[PDB]
Structure formats: structure tokens, C-alpha cells
Design a protein around this nucleic acid. Structure first.
Ligand SMILES: [K+]
Ligand SMILES: [Mg+2]
Ligand SMILES: [Mg+2]
Ligand SMILES: [Mg+2]
Ligand SMILES: [Mg+2]
Lengths: 179, 46, 177, 438, 232, 112, 188
RNA sequence: GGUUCGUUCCAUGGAAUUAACGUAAACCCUUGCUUUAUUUGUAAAUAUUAUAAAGCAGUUCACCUUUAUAUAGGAAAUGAU
């Protein structure tokens, strides 16, 4: 009633191609542009180190994911549309192919071509030009406010928002302890 | 798993949450033999 | 002051720098213009760019002063150009297009048209040969993605008779049972 | 001139010169270094260990996510299957069994390796083949026959637009509805089983796992031919079988062992030691002076100074049509490959690669079942059963006396241990399993 | 709310309940139940053409669908599980059930899971052997020769990298210079610089080493040391 | 009570005290800069005696969840707080089992 | 058409079966200190060689691999989850590390080396590189001048980042990077 | 019945032949040597401490003695090592 014939030799030879694989081509390609994105983000005089530290700042704004340009072009569109529109935060793409896949996967979704001018200056301001706020020298010890700002400006543990919480309570106490 | 059933639910694919399915089967088996939980009292005892 | 020792260089009779060159040009001679043409006729352009750069970078004097044979446990157990990607001994290739996010599984209406379209492609050379029917059950995409063959993450299978495994097992079950 | 700071690091030159010494002692061949990914599930090293403490917890969530992924199945309404909405808990064994994932970590991505035993394809592929070849042959005739009756006169042209095809396609469906659904059901169930290993569905699972490691995840799913070559898949199958109250415990273990084929061996030669003798065929003992200058300098043979000639006499070359022959190249879109890629024969290379691998053949099998596995629904004492077939020893070290590389400082490199926990209606039980390789 | 109740209010309604031929199908469709008038003319044209064909030319058609039914007959046959069955002991989905003969044989075409770790390791050695033979030589085309630092380059900065990792220590920048490199400072002015340097001066090596990790970015830590040295 | 989030945001082994200690880590992260200012005004002997007494009274009114001394590591797998290792966030026992099976990278049985 | 008897194979393929060639440093001033770390020796020893081969093509004279002292952590835990303390056992996590120091290396060239190694990184290995460079006085002035040089190189790279007009989710730019890096880096 | 650290090995039995676990082997540290590497370690250096990857090494040889002639053992700062 039921007798399935053995796999024919033409069938076997066909399954091997799918299972074992076939002889695919391979094209060598290696230029500084194919390595850009993986280099060291060091503040060297060499422009290659400064261009890499700006890309690292763009990856922190985009979510902080590593720079992967050899693992596909897929991503989560429903999560990128939310971040880009509902949260209004930047998005970092490893390649242009990954940007055109989010467009084709979402109905009527428009993404900007690069960041705005004001965002290009803020990235080069600190990550490349390294423009800081010099901590002044406070001579007297009674200058509480000036001394706190001096210390807060000489350590990356006090973020701009963490210092505001400190200076708020401080000024609240110094003002509440006067005649 | 709840986020896995929704990501693939748009394609018409379903999977069972065994960890929660047996939990319900246990609760259902308790009500059968009169061992379920009492009615939650929502007022002070008086 | 150099980096290596001359104990192994003065042993053969290479005391003079001029004699070291006679040992390179005689044994590590660069490719002849005839060989370059023949070597460039078989490999594509992108491959030849790496060969012309490897002979200009690797100077023959280094192969003579410090060129040693590799005996570490990480050397390859055979010689090969590694130009192409082989079926089994290499990782699976990924040369297909990305998948469509809006693609969905075909329905009775879309599945029929897909089946009709398949009958029109093979019928352009009688009737559907089992070789084509087999290429329809295992390759024809049943998603609304315009018949896209996507990259597969399945690892390459092994030969039908693994060296070291074949010729050691016997089937306990018999047909007479 | 030169800077003083630059001149303060030149004088600090007390480095030792490479001596190029000559070996006067015999060297034995190195041990078999097993793969690295088999010692720890996560092959990782990070300088900030904040990315290293949560991994033990994630892998519990990842494995729970890959299990539920390979069990995905269509809704019975999508395939017109008319589900029997019974209150039973059907135990399905003809599904994809997956093992615990093993991840290879780098600062850019993560390669997730999982060994699968696809038992659902063995059934689907058989039935889709049962459909006689006449189906597609006769179906092709309806296409041509229906184009001479409906889209023609009486007994693709410019006057045949697309709107007319819609009505032409429904007539075929109206008469073959009950059959087009049968073929569609088996094809969809097959393509689903096929896409679970392709990017059509993996790119969705990557988005879920990518939220744990914050890296794109690559998959290296390995398809297993038999379920006995992995301890994880073996203890899970046996656990699902024993979950039924009516399951004959002692009988289900014998059915599995009987399916485990072991290679015939010679008990005397297998347990025989190995005498330690200098292997003069090793490249370390052949050329004690490794420098090319000494070798190619007309040491023994004449006019073999060509480096390529020396290598061909040591390694198996594929570019050569003859093993030790010369390399001959032909003198003067399509894929970019070499003009001799087809001539290359990887016959002996498959024999060199697969002979350099240990623990290929299965030579050991042990199963242990412990817990509450009684039939009667009462308080009874625990049960314990153990069955084995073959040995779990390391023949290369226990008998031959060779040096092995234990895993995690104590484990044997050839055994695979896995435990699966389940529960009956009366209590919990576990299924332990060992699988060794020769 | 309350104890959950089952969900049996769902089913897939089959469009067609019985095999309809072109005549009967079009007749019911042309009944004008729910259809566009301008679309009906497309149907009547088909119904007339169908009836115009030789009557027995439908006999061939009706017999054509009957042979396809016979071709799909073995695909819907409920195979009874083997008496001593392992995989289909309690499989309620009759679709997957099959003969279950030979599905457990070992064709000597697979190795254990441990052997696959060593095989995948070789597929990786070939991937690096392919990079070292075809992609590495291209690096020589973009290399640049080393030039010794001139007399003006008197500073020697140090920058840390973790190669794709985020570490709090990759923001520190160290700088070291020699007081005697600054030829603009005289003897007394050089000795005063060793005093102001404080513990940053190494009398043995005669190098003023100083670091800075006060700011969030390496660029800021380097700019501060560049300005600080101008104050020193 | 008021610091417990209305929606559970814990993905590890949840527990009555694990959920309690997680709320103290979030409460302290928000109020640490504020608590550091009060501790700086109390130890600054250059400020008036009144400014130090005000900061000394406000630091006492802070909720207990704001204190860092209330934080105590717990096992993410078992929820215990006795015998924890900072390097793995687990008890000495849970570390043993996972290390033997290979779920903790780099760790192996030591013999010498 | 004919057949040419190739005298030898390409030097790129021959060099793969020889020990990694090394360039000679004329001065010997270190320009990079690459320290690799793994919990397994095999991965590390392989990649150390793959790195030296890439340094030869770039003209970078590499010195190593130098085996640095292995870092050993130790824990002694009871075998039981309860009273049984008289029986314990020792565990360890041995960190194996190497050092490849590059002397007399061009600053930019040394950055391509590290970029090539990160793109082709071997699993299970962590790397840390310290880069040294010589620069003139007036560091601040140089940084400002370079601006236009770096802007031209980023013209085509700005496409990676795209955001809506006047991104409000960021708010304070600097406070965002400061706290986003903390979340990305696990908390520190 | 002997022997061995040892159900180890030999011989033998008018009943044995074999398999798994433990044992043993192997593994980690340590000792001597060889090769590789020379920084952040080493005074110098033609390379010798240290660092750490792989490989070799023992009861091996010599001497003495030795059952049933089968299996072996003894000697311990004045044989080698
Ligand atoms: K700050
Ligand atoms: Mg009750
Ligand atoms: Mg006997
Ligand atoms: Mg030094
Ligand atoms: Mg030594």
C-alpha cells in the first residue's frame, strides 16, 4: 500500500548541493575605507584617529552598538521608527544598505540624510577639538561655590546633570544658614 | 516568550508557553477538587 | 646593529653582502613577464592585485636572512590557494539579498499563481521533469518575496562517508525480520 | 639634529638577538588540542568585566528562546487544518530538538552555535514525495488547456490583459480547491521548517537575542543526522517519552540503546599501549635546522633550491595535477574564480582534515533516570534506573598512554554530559546522559 | 475575568465546499449575488466560450481533474503507525505519521558534537589563511615609512585603546617631555621647571611625565596637557 | 513602598528582598549627588555652625532607601545575600555548579 | 594557447608556510604596545602570529610575542549549599596574555594595523593597545587647524547618523554622551 | 602457588570467555634539559635570572642477585645521572 522508492542518484546529487554547498566565488577587497569604523578612536594628530573618534560619538548617539559592517543589513524597523520618531533620538547605520532596508520595510518612513549642522559642530567640539572648561584656581578656602565647581570640573564622575543636583542642595544650605 | 509570540504572530505562527500552560493546568486542577484560592477580600475585616 | 645573528649566515659562505644576493636571485627570483601573463590569465583582476603587491612587499633578502620553516601546530596541513570558497571545508557563503520585512506566507490565491508561474518558467525550453519538481519543493520560496533564495545559516554538511567513520558500522536490522 | 626625548628611548636597546639555534634533541608530536569553544559555553574575554557577569543568566534566557523558536508552527486556521479543540496536552515528538547554545564572543559580534536534530523534515519530505509526478504533469496541461478555451476563441497575447487573468485563475482554484490546499499545507510546513535555519526568520530572532549582548548575532546551526551524537538532544527526547504516566521506563531505554551503533574493535589492539619512538617523518625532526639558507643550499639533493619545490615535497598540494608534479597554467557575467578551480580534487584533503579530528565515532553511551516514576497515584519511594552501552573512557590516554587536555581542569575531553529535569503528576524526575567519542 | 473559558469561536471557512466545474462555478458567480456589473460581462464572455466548446472537450477536462485526485490520493492516506513505534507512540497529528522504517539508520555521514568543534575550527583557519594570502598584501599599498621626530617634536603623548570596548581608562592621556628639549629656556629656567613639575620629574631619566583623566574625552585631556605645558 | 516601581523591571530571579534591594539602588542613584552635598557641608569646618546643623538635620530625614549602606549584593539566581561573590553575582554554591558545567567563562577547578 | 610551467607559487602563499617574517627597527623606539588576553592559550597563540604577518606587510617591525605573567584568580567554595564545610574545593580563572610591541612605526600605519586586527578579531580574545606619538608645542593651535582636514574626511561618513530636526530626545548633548556611555559600558 | 605500591604480572584449576564504573593511566603545580619569545622583567653581554608556550626525561643504563626458568628483585653520600 505504501512503498517509497529509495532516493534517486539525481536526487542525492541535488541534496548535496544544498547541504554541502557549492563552489562560490570570493573577491578580495581591502582599502582604508573598508577599515574605517574599526580603527582606534585615539586623539592623535593623524586625521585617521580623529575621524574614528567622531564615529564613536555617532555610535553613542545611535544606541552604542558596535560598528558591524559584515553581518548583514537587517535590524528591527519597529524599534528604529520608535526611537527616531517617538523618542526623537539619532540612529546610527553601519552602511547605506542598512538604511535602505529600513525604508523598504516601513510604509512611508523618511529618514534624514546625515545629521544637522548644529549636531556636526557639537561632535567635533569635544570629541575632536577637545574644548574643555578650565578649572580655575581658588585661593581662599571660604569660596565654597567656586571650590565645588573647581572639583566638579576636574573629574568625569560628575556629569552636568549630577553636578546640578549637587549645586542645588548646596546653595539651598548655604542660603538657609545665614542671618 | 511573550515578545517572541508577537514578533512571529504577524506571520501566522504560534508557540506554547509551557511554563505558564502547566501553571494554569495546576490552578484549574485545584478548582476541580475544591482547593483553589478564596475570593480576595477587598475590605477591612468587619 | 641588526636584529638577528650571523652564525647561520656565515656557515654557508654568505659572509659578503654581494654573495647574499647571489643566493636570492638564484632561488627567490621574481616572476618572469611570461609567468605573470600566464598567472594573470587564470586569476581575476582582484586576485592579481594581491599577488603583484605580495612580491613587491616580501623582499627576497628577508627570506634568506630570516626565512624559516613553519612547524607550529597552527600551520595548514596542506597547500591550497584559498581563492574560492569550497563546499564542505569552508564556511557557508552569504551572497544573497536581504529578506523582505513585509513578506508573508502565501495563501491559496497567491500560492496558485506562484505554482502557475513556476509551470511557465520550466516550460520554456516533455513537461515538468522530476529534477524540476525537486527544485520546486526545496528551493521555491513560499513567501511573498518574489522568490528570494535567502542566505542559510545551516552549517555545511559532511561527506556521505566521513573518513575515519565509514567502514566500521553494520546495520543490525535485516529485511527478513 | 634629533630630539632629546627621542634619543632617550634609543639607548634603551638591550634586546636579545634571535640565535637561530640548531636542535640536537628529538621532538615528539604535540598533543591533540581540542576546540576552545567546548570548554566554556561563552568563549569571551573583555577588559571591562561588566559584560561578563550576566552571561550565566542570559544563556538560561537564550536557550529558553531558541527552544520556543524552533517549535513555532502555523495556526491551524492558516493551513485549513480544522484543529480538534481538545482539552488534552498533546506531547509532540516530531519537532526540531535543539541543544544548549555555545557563543563565540568578540568585541563586534557573537556567533551562536546550536546543534539541531530535525525530526519534522524526515516526515514532511517523505509525504510531499508521495505525491505522484503526474500531479505536476497533469496540472501543467490544465494551464495550457484552460488558455485555449477561456482566453482564446473557439476550436500571452496583447489583447489578454491582467484583469482577465484574475477570473481565469479562480476557475482553476474552484475546481482544485480541495487539492491546492493539500499541497499548500505540506509546502508551507516544509518551507517553515526550512526558513527556521535561513535569514527569512532568523533576522527576527536576532533582534530578540541582540538585546541581551548588544551585538549582532550570527548563527551556526549544525544539523545532526542522528539524535545519539548529542547528549542534550538525547536526554530531552527520552524525557518527553517518560512524561506519560503509561510510559514503560525500562523498555524505552532499551529501544534507544539498540539504536546506538558502535564500531567493531579489537579488544587487544585497542587497549594496547604505544611505544615512544622518534617519528622521523615529523617536520620538526626532518629538518633540525629550519632556516631556508641551510636547507636550499644544495644540502643533499641537487638544484632543488626553489622554495615551492621544497614545500611540495612536504605538504599535499591541490594546484598540481600530479602530486609531486609541476604546476602548469594555461597560457593565452560569469563568476570570478580561477581557471583551474574545477580541476582541484579535495579527495585526500577530506582525508587529512577528518583524520586530524578525534572523538568522531560514538563509542560510549550511559543513561540514568531517577525520581518519582511509579504508575499508581500514591506516595511511593523514589525509583532509579541505569543503562549503558560501551565505555566513556579516553582510550588515547587510559590505554595508549598519550597526553590529553582535560576540560575545565577536571573533565574528560571526549564525554558529553547533559541533564534534563521534568515532572510527572506525582513528582519531579531527572534524566542524565553521557555520550563519549572514539 | 473570572475563571478562563476555552476559545472555540474560530475556524477557517473553506471557500468552496465541493468541486465546481467551469460551467457551474461561472453560473453561480454570474448569479449576481455580490459582483460588479462591469465585471460580470467578463464572466458571461467566459460562460459563453465554455459552452461553445465541443461537449466532450469537457469530458476530457472533467476526467483531467479526476486523475489529479488520484495523483493526490496517497498524500491523504492516513498511515497507521507501526505496532512497535517509537516516534509516533501518541502522535495525534496523522499528517506526520509514516512507515518509520530506516529513519534511525546511521549512514556513516556525521560525527559527534565534539568533532564539529574541531571541524568548525578548521573552517576558521582557512578563513584567516584566505585573508593572509589575498587581503594582507593589499595593506602594503597604504603603508607609510617611519620618519624620525624632528627637533621641534619634543612631546611624546600616549593614548589608550581597547579595540571596540568601552573602558573608563581609555580617556587618560599621558605626556612626557625632556626639560633640555626646550632650547628657549636657560639653565635657571630649566631647573625651575623641574621644581614646578614636582613629583612628575624623574631625576634618573630626566623626563617630566604627567597625565590627565579629568575630562570625558581624550581630546579634552590632551588639550589640557597642551595648555598646561605652555603654563609650566 | 513608594520606591517600588508599579511595573516590574527585573529580569533575574525575583524575590521579596531582591525587589527591595533593587529599589534602594535606584533611589540612591537619584539622590547620591544630593546626599554628597549634605555630607560635604557637615565636614566643612569653614562654614557657619548653623549651615552645618541644617545639613545635619536634613541628612537624617532622608528615606532609608537613600542610604548606600542599605545596599547588599544578592544572588541573581537564588536571591540569597549570605555568601555572595562580587565577580559573578551569585552564591558560592551557584558559582560552583555553573563553573563545573561550563556556564561561567574562564573558571576551572584549581589543582596545584 | 599553451601551458607555462610555473617555477614557484606566489610569495603570499609561500609565506603562509613559513615563520612570520619581521622587519628591522633602525632606532627601536616603541610606537605601540598591543596586549592580548584570553582564557585559552590556543586562540591567543594563533592570533599573535596572524598579527605579526600583517605587521610585516605594513612595514611595522614587531617584537614578540612576549609572554607576560599569567593572571590567576582563586576562590575556595564549599561543595555543599549547607552545613558541610569540612569539605571544600578550589577554583581558578587563569588569564593568559601576550605582548606585541611595535617599534619605529608610523602613527597612521600603526592605526591601520589595529583596525585590521579588530575587523578580523579571533573570538575569545581581548586586546588593549597603547599608542605613542610625537607632537610639537602649541597643541591647542594644531587641533583647531586640523578641523577642516578632518571635516573633508567626514563628508561622506556623516550619512551614518540621521536624526529628526532639532533632536529633543537628546536634550543636553554632553550630559547625554556622558550617561549613554555609562549604560553602554555596563555602568562604568 | 608466587610476585607486586596494586585483582599488578606469571603459572595453574574436572569451566571458563568477556563488558562497564572505580583502580590504573593521563591531567594541574613542581624538578632537569631542549626549542621559541626579550617588554612593562634582566648590570653587562656573543644571552646566563625572570616570564611561559611546546617537547623530552627514570629506575633508564651499569653492578649484584634471581623461584617452577614463567613473572623479577635488591643495593640508597663515595657507578653514571
Ligand atoms: K565634570
Ligand atoms: Mg480553600
Ligand atoms: Mg582464571
Ligand atoms: Mg625596556
Ligand atoms: Mg628558563
Amino acid at each position: 500500500d505504501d512503498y517509497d522508492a529509495p532516493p534517486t542518484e539525481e536526487e542525492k546529487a541535488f541534496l548535496r548541493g544544498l547541504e554541502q554547498g557549492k563552489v562560490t566565488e570570493y573577491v578580495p577587497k581591502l582599502t582604508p575605507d573598508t577599515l574605517l569604523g574599526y580603527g582606534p578612536p585615539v586623539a592623535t594628530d593623524a586625521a585617521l584617529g580623529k575621524v574614528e573618534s567622531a564615529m564613536r560619538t555617532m555610535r553613542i548617539l545611535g544606541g552604542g552598538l558596535p560598528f558591524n559592517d559584515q553581518s548583514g543589513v537587517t535590524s528591527d524597523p519597529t524599534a528604529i521608527k520608535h526611537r527616531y520618531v517617538h523618542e526623537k533620538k539619532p540612529v546610527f547605520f553601519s552602511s547605506v544598505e542598512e538604511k535602505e532596508w529600513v525604508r523598504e520595510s516601513l510604509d512611508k518612513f523618511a529618514v534624514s540624510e546625515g545629521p544637522e549642522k548644529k549636531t556636526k559642530q557639537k561632535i567635533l567640539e569635544t570629541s575632536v577639538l577637545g574644548k574643555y572648561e578650565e578649572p580655575k584656581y581658588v585661593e581662599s578656602l571660604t569660596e565654597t561655590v567656586k571650590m565645588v565647581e573647581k572639583y566638579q570640573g576636574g573629574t568625569f564622575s560628575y556629569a552636568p546633570s549630577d553636578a546640578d543636583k549637587f549645586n542645588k542642595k548646596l546653595n539651598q544650605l548655604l542660603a538657609a544658614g545665614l542671618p | 516568550i511573550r515578545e517572541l509570540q508577537k514578533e512571529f504572530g504577524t506571520l501566522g505562527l504560534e508557540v506554547d508557553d509551557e511554563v505558564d500552560d502547566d501553571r494554569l493546568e495546576h490552578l484549574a486542577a485545584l478548582r476541580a477538587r475544591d482547593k483553589g484560592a478564596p475570593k480576595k477580600k477587598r475590605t477591612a475585616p468587619s | 646593529r641588526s636584529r638577528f645573528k650571523n652564525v647561520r649566515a656565515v656557515e654557508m659562505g654568505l659572509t659578503s653582502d654581494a654573495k647574499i644576493e647571489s643566493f636570492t636571485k638564484k632561488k627567490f627570483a621574481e616572476y618572469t613577464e611570461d609567468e605573470k601573463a600566464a598567472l594573470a590569465h587564470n586569476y581575476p583582476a582582484e586576485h592579481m592585485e594581491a599577488i603583484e603587491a605580495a612580491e613587491a612587499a616580501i623582499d627576497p633578502k628577508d627570506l634568506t636572512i630570516q626565512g624559516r620553516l613553519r612547524v607550529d601546530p597552527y600551520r595548514m596541513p596542506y597547500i591550497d590557494d584559498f581563492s574560492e570558497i569550497q563546499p564542505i571545508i569552508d564556511k557557508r557563503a552569504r551572497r544573497s539579498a536581504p529578506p523582505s520585512h513585509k513578506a508573508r506566507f502565501m495563501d491559496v490565491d497567491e500560492f496558485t499563481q506562484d505554482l502557475i508561474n513556476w509551470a511557465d518558467e520550466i516550460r520554456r525550453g516533455t513537461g515538468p521533469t522530476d529534477g524540476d519538481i525537486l527544485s520546486y519543493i526545496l528551493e521555491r520560496s513560499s513567501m511573498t518575496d518574489n522568490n528570494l533564495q535567502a542566505n542559510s545559516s545551516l552549517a555545511p554538511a559532511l561527506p556521505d562517508k566521513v573518513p575515519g567513520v565509514e567502514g566500521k558500522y553494520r546495520n543490525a536490522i535485516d529485511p527478513a525480520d | 639634529s634629533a630630539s632629546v626625548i627621542f634619543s632617550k628611548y634609543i639607548n634603551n636597546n638591550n634586546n636579545k638577538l634571535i640565535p637561530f639555534k640548531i636542535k640536537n634533541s628529538d621532538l615528539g608530536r604535540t598533543r591533540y588540542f581540542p576546540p576552545i569553544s567546548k570548554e566554556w559555553k561563552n568563549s569571551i574575554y573583555v577588559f571591562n568585566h561588566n559584560n561578563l557577569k550576566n552571561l550565566p543568566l542570559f544563556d538560561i534566557n537564550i536557550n529558553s528562546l531558541i527552544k520556543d523558536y524552533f517549535n513555532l508552527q502555523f495556526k491551524d486556521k492558516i493551513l485549513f487544518k480544522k484543529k480538534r479543540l481538545s482539552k488534552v496536552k498533546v506531547v509532540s515528538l516530531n519537532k526540531i530538538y535543539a541543544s544548549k547554545a555555545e557563543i563565540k564572543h568578540t568585541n563586534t559580534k557573537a556567533i551562536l552555535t546550536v546543534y539541531t536534530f530535525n525530526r519534522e523534515k524526515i516526515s514532511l519530505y517523505k509525504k510531499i514525495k508521495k505525491l505522484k509526478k503526474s500531479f505536476y504533469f497533469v496540472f501543467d496541461k490544465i494551464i495550457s488547456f484552460s488558455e485555449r478555451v477561456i482566453l482564446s476563441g473557439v476550436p500571452v497575447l496583447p489583447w489578454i490583459t491582467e484583469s482577465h487573468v484574475n477570473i481565469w485563475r479562480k476557475i482553476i482554484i474552484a475546481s482544485l480547491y480541495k487539492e491546492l490546499i493539500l499541497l499548500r499545507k505540506y509546502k508551507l510546513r516544509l518551507d517553515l521548517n526550512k526558513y527556521k535555519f535561513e535569514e527569512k526568520l532568523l533576522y527576527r530572532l536576532n533582534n530578540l537575542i541582540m538585546k541581551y549582548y548588544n551585538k549582532k548575532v550570527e548563527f551556526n546551526i549544525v544539523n545532526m543526522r542522528s539524535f545519539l551524537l548529542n547528549s542534550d538532544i538525547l536526554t530531552k527526547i527520552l524525557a518527553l517519552k517518560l512524561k506519560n504516566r503509561n510510559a514503560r521506563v525500562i523498555k524505552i531505554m532499551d529501544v534507544i540503546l539498540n539504536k546506538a551503533n558502535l564500531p567493531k574493535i579489537n579488544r587487544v589492539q585497542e587497549k594496547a599501549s604505544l611505544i615512544k619512538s622518534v617519528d622521523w617523518n615529523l617536520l620538526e625532526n626532518k629538518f633540525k635546522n629550519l632556516n631556508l639558507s641551510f636547507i636550499l643550499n644544495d644540502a643533499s639533493y641537487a638544484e632543488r633550491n626553489n622554495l615551492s619545490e621544497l614545500l611540495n615535497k612536504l605538504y599535499y598540494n591541490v594546484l598540481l595535477v600530479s602530486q609531486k608534479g609541476v604546476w602548469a597554467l594555461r597560457s593565452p557575467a560569469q563568476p570570478k574564480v580561477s581557471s583551474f578551480a574545477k580541476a582541484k580534487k579535495y579527495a585526500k584533503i577530506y582525508q587529512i582534515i577528518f583524520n586530524s579530528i578525534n572523538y568522531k565515532n560514538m563509542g560510549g553511551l550511559r543513561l540514568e533516570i531517577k525520581g518519582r516514576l511509579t504508575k499508581r497515584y500514591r506516595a511511593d519511594r523514589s525509583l532509579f534506573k541505569v543503562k549503558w552501552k560501551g565505555g566513556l573512557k579516553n582510550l588515547d590516554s587510559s590505554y595508549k598512554g598519550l597526553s590529553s587536555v582535560n576540560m575545565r581542569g577536571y573533565a574528560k575531553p571526549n564525554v558529553e554530559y547533559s541533564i534534563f529535569t521534568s515532572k510527572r503528576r506525582i513528582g519531579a524526575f531527572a534524566v542524565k546522559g553521557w555520550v563519549s567519542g572514539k | 475575568e473570572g475563571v478562563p473559558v476555552p476559545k472555540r469561536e474560530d475556524d477557517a471557512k473553506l471557500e468552496f465546499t465541493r468541486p465546481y466545474n467551469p460551467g457551474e462555478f461561472l453560473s453561480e458567480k454570474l448569479r449576481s449575488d455580490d459582483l460588479q456589473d462591469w465585471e460580470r460581462e467578463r464572466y458571461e464572455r467566459a460562460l459563453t466560450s465554455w459552452e461553445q466548446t465541443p461537449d466532450d472537450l469537457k469530458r476530457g477536462w472533467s476526467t483531467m481533474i479526476r486523475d489529479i485526485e488520484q495523483a493526490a490520493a496517497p498524500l491523504r492516506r492516513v498511515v497507521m503507525p507501526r505496532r512497535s513505534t517509537f516516534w509516533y507512540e501518541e502522535e495525534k497529528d496523522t499528517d506526520l505519521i509514516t512507515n518509520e522504517d530506516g529513519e534511525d539508520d546511521f549512514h556513516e555521514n556525521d560525527i559527534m558534537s565534539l568533532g564539529h568543534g574541531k571541524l568548525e575550527e578548521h573552517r576558521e583557519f582557512r578563513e584567516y589563511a584566505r585573508i593572509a594570502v589575498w587581503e594582507m598584501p593589499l595593506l602594503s599599498k597604504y603603508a607609510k615609512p617611519f620618519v624620525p621626530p624632528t627637533s621641534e617634536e619634543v612631546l611624546r603623548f600616549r593614548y589608550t585603546t581597547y579595540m571596540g570596548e568601552f573602558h573608563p581608562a581609555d580617556r587618560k592621556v599621558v605626556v612626557e617631555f625632556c626639560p633640555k628639549d626646550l632650547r628657549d629656556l636657560s639653565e635657571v629656567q630649566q631647573r625651575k621647571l623641574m621644581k614646578l613639575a614636582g613629583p612628575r620629574y624623574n631625576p634618573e631619566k630626566d623626563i617630566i611625565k604627567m597625565s590627565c583623566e579629568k575630562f570625558e574625552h581624550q581630546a579634552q585631556n590632551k588639550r589640557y596637557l597642551g595648555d598646561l605645558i605652555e603654563k609650566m | 513602598s513608594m520606591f517600588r516601581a508599579k511595573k516590574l523591571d527585573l529580569g533575574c530571579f525575583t524575590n521579596v528582598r531582591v525587589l527591595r534591594d533593587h529599589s534602594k539602588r535606584k533611589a540612591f542613584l537619584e539622590a547620591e549627588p544630593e546626599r554628597q552635598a549634605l555630607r560635604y557641608v557637615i565636614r566643612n569646618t569653614t562654614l557657619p555652625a548653623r549651615t552645618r546643623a541644617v545639613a545635619q538635620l536634613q541628612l537624617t530625614q532622608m528615606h532609608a532607601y537613600t542610604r548606600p549602606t542599605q545596599i547588599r549584593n544578592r544572588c541573581i539566581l537564588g536571591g540569597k545575600s549570605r555568601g555572595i561573590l562580587r565577580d559573578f553575582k551569585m552564591t558560592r554554591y551557584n558559582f560552583r555548579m555553573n563553573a563545573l558545567m561550563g556556564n561561567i567563562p574562564g573558571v576551572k577547578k584549581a589543582s596545584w | 594557447e599553451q601551458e607555462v610551467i610555473m617555477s614557484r607559487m606566489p610569495r603570499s602563499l609561500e609565506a603562509l608556510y613559513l615563520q612570520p617574517l619581521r622587519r628591522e627597527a633602525e632606532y627601536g623606539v616603541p610606537s605601540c604596545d598591543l596586549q592580548l588576553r584570553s582564557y585559552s592559550i590556543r586562540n591567543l597563540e594563533f592570533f599573535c602570529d596572524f598579527a605579526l604577518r600583517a605587521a610585516y606587510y605594513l612595514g611595522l617591525p614587531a617584537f614578540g610575542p612576549v609572554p607576560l605573567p599569567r593572571m590567576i584568580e582563586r576562590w575556595t567554595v564549599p561543595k555543599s549549599h549547607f552545613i558541610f564545610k569540612k569539605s571544600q574545593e578550589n577554583f581558578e580563572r587563569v588569564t593568559l596574555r601576550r605582548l606585541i610591541q611595535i617599534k619605529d612605526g608610523h602613527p597612521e600605519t600603526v592605526q591601520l594595523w589595529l583596525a585590521f586586527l579588530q575587523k578580523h578579531a579571533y573570538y575569545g580574545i581581548g586586546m588593549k593597545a597603547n599608542v605613542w606619538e610625537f607632537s610639537k608645542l602649541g597643541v591647542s593651535k594644531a587641533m583647531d587647524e586640523s578641523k577642516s582636514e578632518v571635516e573633508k574626511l567626514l563628508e561622506t561618513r556623516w550619512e551614518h547618523l540621521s536624526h529628526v530636526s532639532d533632536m529633543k530626545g537628546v536634550g543636553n548633548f554632553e550630559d547625554f554622551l556622558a550617561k549613554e556611555r555609562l549604560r553602554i559600558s555596563g555602568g562604568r
